[PDB]
């Protein structure tokens, strides 16, 4: 009864649907990642976290503005 109801073809289709659904869910998660990283950007700069990581790496002992100004120069050129 079960196999007649839940055949192999139905299984394959259902599993493919599962896979595609969760791929779509990954896309959703990536979309939310991008947005949340864009929103909370003033409260979480990059330079600060970089400096903290470098300092704490030097401590734990392991190795790992002018740019925009020059781009402005190019824009003026």
């Amino acid at each position: 009864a079960t196999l007649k109801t839940m055949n192999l073809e139905k299984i394959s289709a259902l599993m493919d649907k599962f896979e595609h659904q969760f791929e779509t869910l990954d896309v959703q998660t990536q979309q939310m990642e991008d947005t949340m990283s864009s929103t909370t950007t003033l409260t979480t700069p990059q330079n600060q976290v970089d400096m903290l990581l470098q300092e704490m790496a030097d401590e734990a002992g392991l190795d790992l503005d002018e740019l925009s100004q020059r781009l402005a120069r190019l824009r003026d050129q």
Binding site: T41, Q46, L67, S68, L74, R75
Partner: protein, 181 residues
């Protein structure tokens, strides 16, 4: 019309433009890293389009800065424009540019649309849904070009790529065909 509404909305536009400028700057700084990474993995045209996004965003930032300047000028001379019925030579450029840019940035900032409406309903000489379209032919050329929608020159993009590769300590072989012209 209501003048205090215009004044308040101008202040709000100023503040919103400040915040958006800072935010766009941060996002650009964070995306340049991605551009470098794409450059450091074979992909070259991809990073090219990314830096195209970047330069467009930076033009937007510059346009917003100029717009904030004009808005602050208008907020300063508010007392002058609130009395006279016809605008002067000093405010003509500001008003024209602002009314022309309102529909351009209506998505990023909304108060700008209200400002444009207040200015349209305030003036009648060459002002309106159709009269403004013809009377906005004296807006700032610099801002008009920065806020325009056109593919930047490939040489500028190539130079941006070269520089971004230099700063991030990564190689990049710019196309000689573009570097020549």
């Amino acid at each position: 019309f209501k003048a205090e509404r215009l004044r308040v909305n101008l202040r709000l536009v100023i503040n919103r433009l400040k915040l958006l400028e800072k935010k766009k700057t941060e996002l650009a700084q964070k995306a340049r890293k991605e551009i470098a990474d794409y450059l450091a993995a074979g992909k070259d045209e991809r990073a090219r389009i990314r830096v195209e996004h970047i330069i467009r965003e930076d033009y937007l930032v510059e346009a917003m800065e100029i717009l904030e300047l004009y808005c602050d000028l208008l907020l300063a001379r508010f007392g002058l424009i609130q009395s006279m019925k016809e605008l002067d030579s000093g405010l003509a450029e500001s008003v024209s540019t602002l009314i022309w840019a309102a529909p351009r940035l209506q998505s990023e900032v909304a108060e700008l649309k209200i400002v444009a409406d207040q200015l349209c309903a305030k003036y009648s000489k060459e002002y309106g849904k159709l009269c403004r379209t013809n009377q906005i032919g004296t807006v700032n050329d610099r801002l008009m070009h920065k806020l325009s929608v056109e593919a930047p020159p490939k040489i500028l993009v190539e130079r941006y790529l070269i520089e971004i590769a230099k700063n991030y300590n990564v190689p990049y072989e710019p196309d000689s065909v573009v570097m020549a012209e």
